[PDB]
Design a protein around this nucleic acid. Structure first.
Ligand SMILES: [Mg+2]
Ligand SMILES: [Mg+2]
Ligand SMILES: [Mg+2]
Ligand SMILES: [Mg+2]
Ligand SMILES: [Mg+2]
Ligand SMILES: [Zn+2]
Lengths: 102, 129, 24, 83, 221, 71, 83, 135, 220
RNA sequence: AGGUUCGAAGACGAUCAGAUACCGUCGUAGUUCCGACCAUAAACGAUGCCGACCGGCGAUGCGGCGGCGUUAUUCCCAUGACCCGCCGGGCAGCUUCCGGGAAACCAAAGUCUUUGGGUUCCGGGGGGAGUAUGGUUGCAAAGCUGAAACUUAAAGGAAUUGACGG
């Protein structure tokens, strides 16, 4: 049975997509098939925002951020619990989970 | 490419009748199409039709009366004699009471009952019921 | 067996058979 | 709509449809009187001209060929002919 | 209604325009296109008021075609319309259903809530989809108060007006109640109806607790 | 789909008899290998001389000795 | 029905949809038959009798019952031409 | 933990707060005695449970309208829904703001050019719709 | 002792509606089996087609339930097929009878040719369709009988069809689909549009709006 | 020719009951370029091409045509960047009781017992077997064409319930 009309990948008008390497296990994954994370992490933990601010020689010092783009094979993605198996109906929706802004 | 113009017109009015459209436009008109539409009108299966004249093969708009069921075509125009006509009748027509087989004979394009009445076979064109 | 390895086992067998036929 | 009037559809649907798919084929293009400044004569130019028309009396171009419609030079008048 | 007696009048148009009623949504349904007039630069489709009036007369004609006033059942699953159907049922003798519509009302013949009306009137086809679906099971004709983006799958005398604004919803339930009462031997067409249209207006429960005391304060002072 | 022309009879029959070789019943009755492999040689019966008396075990879900003769 | 003896031998004659001319089946529960009550000329009052339409389940399931019913209303005369 | 009131105690409570709202009150003891003449309750641990949840509803029904009905609350649901008819209707606006297109449409109906109707300046920019996608 | 809860059941009880065909004309749903044995009583023949024991895997073994396919109908133009699944055979039998009673449809009989007396065969070739089973009923001349498989044969016989050619495709061994496909083909005999039905219909009073005064007093 | 990285084979260290492995350290052929072969992939959409007809909706890419306005310059039009539409041709998506289907699902996998638009290739229960043999192509590896004897009552597909999951 065909589990996904997408076939698991965003390949639609192509014949070939250049592979990438999983950032967790170095598996060759097609670029479309790979689960992608883009994490904008503050370069300090949320608990060190105070001790750094006091030791900083600059008063109004905005603190730098870390920009890393992660690529996961689905094997690593599920094991690391970034994506989760969903019900047959719930597999369809493509909207991302909410940011939980409140 | 398009090879049977009559086959395309028949399919178009069959699909339109299934959907329930009041009118249907068949794009490539031809003499065989007009005669085939004429025999359907004389038997009441379709309403008025009007041939739109452009300098190319004109278009035709047919008023569907909703009392049609199937207007298929027999694409390989088999030669039908008067002795095998009944074998085509029971193979295609839903019953002996209604339904018509249209064949082109040397006396023109007409239905099977009339073709048999003037005692002439011909080439099968299509059917409707 | 895996269908691919059965294919490999058969190729190895075919190569052995050609060697014996060539020997004759 | 099961009862669309295919026989007498109004003008504005026709101008919306493709030239070929209209009830009778009609050309979108037109011919126009072109009056460039500084001459006396009137030049007939296709609306979708592929060439660079020129007055045989005055040495200035009138239209520049583009993707779809001709590009008249600035200062040139144009009139339609009998629609 | 081709008749001059059965025509829009200026006062009716004024109440339509005052309540909105002509401002549709930003989305158009292909079934609702032949009812629409034009779309503004804002992007709101303008319904044709004359077309709305005729369909409202057509719906009134269907309602008065039933000998049993209690037979026709008027329903609404949204608060903006629950008040309107209650008043409509009281004035016209219809059978009201407000709020939750239990499934199997027209199909399951066991529970006491089971009813088998000869006509269904729906405030919103999207909101009241369950009674519309059950009507297909039970040979039931339907009238709906449809907007420019509402589906017409099981609708017959769709009135192409509005179902979003509380002003528009209550005004036309009042309009429909007046027309069926005028076609029947209750109103003589000449003098205006005593039932004032804001009786069918749905009132936000935030105003329901302060407007009555403010009026009481004005009366005493 | 299949061809339906007026003068495609040659293709239709040639394709038919090529595809008729793909079912066992036609292959068996028209190849001749089955006839040669048949011990009886296409005969309903055959006489023979009893060479021995042997017993054959039944299949798995059964358990019996079937008394046969080698002929 | 109506064999050569002339008698109508058929236990009932089914209705036809007034929009698509299709047979209303005995188990077509989606199908409706509804009545529209016309008024008199002077006072716009319900004058007793009425006119009825039948819509098959298929037509009123694809969503064309609304367009159909109004379209019959024009033909009979209930809805003004200026609609 | 573990003091959820079963259906029976709750279901009996609602019946005796609609049958007998006036007699009951917000006292566990006064209500636990009315429940001794208004009902045949087999167990003592049942009436006190029934009496206990009755107070929770009677305390709550004094404020909010719990699903259990009451005549004095229902008559006010009637009075507010069926009256407070404003003496001046909301749909009698002295001036009716009018888009140019609606005035064009009303003109076709020949009911245009009414004095109460006032044309409004059309909006410019056609900036409706929301930015597509996230961001 | 039958107290109905339906406007249709109400009217049929007190001899207002006269024929089942009147109900069929208006396509009204039948929700009380007591309606038909009023109109059609002491003429229906009941026959059980198959008792298949479907079963569900559970924690403690498999529970077994019984499905009964029951076909009924007088041999004059009315037939019905009902399917009921219960945990006793006897309860499944009565449930399948009631469901077959509810789904009774009229059968149109036609003529093979030269329409002389009572119609004997199907008016035209029709096709029923359930699962992979395709059942086609073909008009046959007088005296041919029902040439068909045993399961459709009894269903056509109690439908009133005297003569009929039959062709079936698919897993006919699935009796439920095979019987339901035959019942499908039979039911659409009136769904088929035929030139003798081309005349314009004259609508009559609906049973609900014609006895609406009676329904007010009685069905209150 | 070139050989940085990675890395079949191989060596070693670990793990293990054994460990010709998974993990780790090296590391040959290869991986790179030019020329010449080979012709196979789950070479996939497991889905022939050409043509017609049969719902709705929002987008997207290209081209063209219209238009309130914003913006770039300039003194105006174009012209670019947005904005609202229309047409044609693409990649797709959502939705639907078009219809089909064993169903999963498919606006095609629809217009099929109401069976015929034109035309290719190709399947006939599971194995034996893509095997044997012959022919042919190739440096080779192998490619193409391709049986039979014999054996077997099932093998399979889609969905349901339950059980189980390091
Ligand atoms: Mg799987
Ligand atoms: Mg590929
Ligand atoms: Mg290394
Ligand atoms: Mg072809
Ligand atoms: Mg085989
Ligand atoms: Zn990984």
């Amino acid at each position: 049975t065909k589990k996904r009309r997408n076939n698991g990948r965003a390949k639609k008008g192509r014949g070939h997509v250049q592979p990438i390497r999983c950032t967790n296990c170095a598996r060759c994954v097609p670029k479309d098939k790979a689960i992608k994370k883009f994490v904008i992490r503050n370069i300090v933990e949320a608990a060190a925002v105070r001790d750094i601010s006091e030791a900083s020689v600059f008063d109004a010092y905005v603190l730098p951020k870390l920009y890393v783009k992660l690529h996961y094979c689905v094997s690593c993605a599920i094991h690391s619990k970034v994506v989760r198996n969903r019900s047959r109906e719930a597999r369809k929706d493509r909207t991302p989970p909410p940011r939980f802004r409140p | 490419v398009r090879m049977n113009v009559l086959a395309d017109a028949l399919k178009s009015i069959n699909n339109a009748e299934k959907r329930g459209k009041r009118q249907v436009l068949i794009r490539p008109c031809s003499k065989v199409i007009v005669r085939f539409l004429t025999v359907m009108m004389k038997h009441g299966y379709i309403g008025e039709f009007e041939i739109i004249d452009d300098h190319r093969a004109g278009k035709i708009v047919v008023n569907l009366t909703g009392r049609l069921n199937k207007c298929g075509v027999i694409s390989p125009r088999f030669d039908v004699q008067l002795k095998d006509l009944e074998k085509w009748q029971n193979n295609l027509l839903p019953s002996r009471q209604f339904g018509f087989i249209v064949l082109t004979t040397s006396a023109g394009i007409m239905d099977h009952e009339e073709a048999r009445r003037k005692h002439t076979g011909g080439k099968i064109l299509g059917f409707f019921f | 067996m895996r269908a691919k390895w059965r294919k490999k086992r058969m190729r190895r067998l075919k190569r052995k058979r050609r060697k014996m036929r060539q020997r004759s | 709509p099961l009862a669309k009037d295919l026989l007498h559809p109004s003008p504005e649907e026709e101008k919306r449809k493709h030239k070929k798919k209209r009830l009778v084929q009609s050309p979108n293009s037109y011919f126009m009187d072109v009056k460039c400044p500084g001459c006396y004569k009137i030049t007939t130019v296709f609306s979708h001209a592929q060439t660079v028309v020129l007055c045989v009396g005055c040495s200035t171009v009138l239209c520049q060929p583009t993707g779809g419609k001709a590009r008249l030079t600035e200062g040139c008048s144009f009139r339609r002919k009998q629609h | 209604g081709a008749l001059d007696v059965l025509q829009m009048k200026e006062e009716d148009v004024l109440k339509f325009l005052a309540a909105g009623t002509h401002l549709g949504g930003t989305n158009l349904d292909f079934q609702m296109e032949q009812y629409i007039y034009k779309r503004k630069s804002d992007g709101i489709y303008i319904i044709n008021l004359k077309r709305t009036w005729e369909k409202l007369l057509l719906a009134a004609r269907a309602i008065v075609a039933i000998e049993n006033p209690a037979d026709v059942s008027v329903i609404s699953s949204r608060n903006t319309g629950q008040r309107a159907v209650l008043k409509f049922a009281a004035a016209t003798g219809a059978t009201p259903i407000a709020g939750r519509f239990t499934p199997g009302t027209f199909t399951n013949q066991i529970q006491a809530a089971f009813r088998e009306p000869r006509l269904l009137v729906v405030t919103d086809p999207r909101a009241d989809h369950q009674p519309l679906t059950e009507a297909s099971y039970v040979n039931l004709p339907t009238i709906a108060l449809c907007n420019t983006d509402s589906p017409l799958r099981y609708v017959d005398i769709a009135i192409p007006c509005n179902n979003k604004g509380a002003h528009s919803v209550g005004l036309m339930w009042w309009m429909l109640a007046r027309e069926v009462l005028r076609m029947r031997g209750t109103i003589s067409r000449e003098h205006p109806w005593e039932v004032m249209p804001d009786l069918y207006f749905y009132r936000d429960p935030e105003e329901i607790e302060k407007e009555e005391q403010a009026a009481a304060e004005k009366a005493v002072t | 789909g299949k061809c339906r022309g007026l003068r495609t009879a040659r293709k239709l029959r040639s394709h038919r008899r090529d595809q008729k070789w793909h079912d066992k019943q036609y292959k068996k009755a028209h190849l001749g290998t089955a006839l040669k492999a048949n011990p009886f040689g296409g005969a309903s019966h055959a006489k023979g001389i009893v060479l021995e008396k042997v017993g054959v075990e039944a299949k798995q879900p059964n358990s019996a000795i079937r008394k046969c003769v080698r002929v | 029905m109506q064999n050569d003896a002339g008698e109508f031998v058929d236990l009932y004659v089914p209705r036809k949809c007034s929009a698509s001319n299709r047979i209303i089946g005995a188990k077509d529960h989606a199908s409706i038959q509804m009545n529209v009550a016309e008024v008199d000329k002077v006072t716009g009052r319900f004058n007793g009798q009425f006119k009825t339409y039948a819509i098959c389940g298929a037509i009123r399931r694809m969503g064309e019952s609304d367009d159909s019913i109004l379209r019959l209303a024009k033909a009979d005369g209930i809805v003004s031409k200026n609609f | 933990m573990g003091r959820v009131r079963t259906k029976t105690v709750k279901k009996a409570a609602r019946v005796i707060i609609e049958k007998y709202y006036t007699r009951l009150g917000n006292d566990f003891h006064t209500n636990k005695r009315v429940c001794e003449e208004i009902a045949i309750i087999p167990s003592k641990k049942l009436r006190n449970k029934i009496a206990g949840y009755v107070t929770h509803l009677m305390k709550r029904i004094q404020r909010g309208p719990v699903r259990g009905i009451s005549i004095k609350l229902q008559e006010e649901e009637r009075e507010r829904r069926d009256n407070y008819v404003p003496e001046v209707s909301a749909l009698d606006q002295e001036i009716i703001e009018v888009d140019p297109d609606t005035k064009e449409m009303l003109k076709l109906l020949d009911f245009g050019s009414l004095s109460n109707l006032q044309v409004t300046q059309p909006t410019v920019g056609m900036n409706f719709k929301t930015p597509r996608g996230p961001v | 002792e039958w107290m109905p809860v339906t406007k249709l059941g109400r009217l049929v009880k007190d001899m207002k509606i006269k024929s089942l065909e009147e109900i069929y004309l208006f396509s009204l749903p039948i929700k009380e089996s007591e309606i038909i044995d009023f109109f059609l009583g002491a003429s229906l023949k009941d026959e059980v087609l198959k008792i298949m024991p479907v079963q569900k895997q559970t924690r403690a073994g498999q529970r077994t339930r019984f499905k009964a396919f029951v076909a009924i109908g007088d041999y004059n133009g009315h037939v019905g097929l009902g399917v009921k699944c219960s945990k006793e055979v006897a309860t499944a039998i009565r449930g399948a009878i009631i469901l077959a009673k509810l789904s009774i449809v009229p059968v149109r009989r036609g003529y093979w040719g030269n329409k002389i007396g009572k119609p004997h065969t199907v008016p035209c070739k029709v096709t029923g369709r359930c699962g992979s089973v395709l059942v086609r009923l073909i008009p046959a001349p007088r005296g041919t009988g029902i040439v068909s498989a045993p399961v459709p044969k009894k269903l056509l016989m109690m439908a009133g069809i005297d003569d009929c050619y039959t062709s079936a495709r698919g897993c006919t061994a699935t009796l439920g689909n095979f019987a339901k496909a035959t019942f499908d083909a039979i039911s659409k005999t009136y769904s088929y549009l035929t030139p003798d039905l081309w005349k314009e219909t004259v609508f009559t009073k609906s049973p609900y709006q014609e006895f609406t005064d009676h329904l007010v007093k009685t069905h209150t």
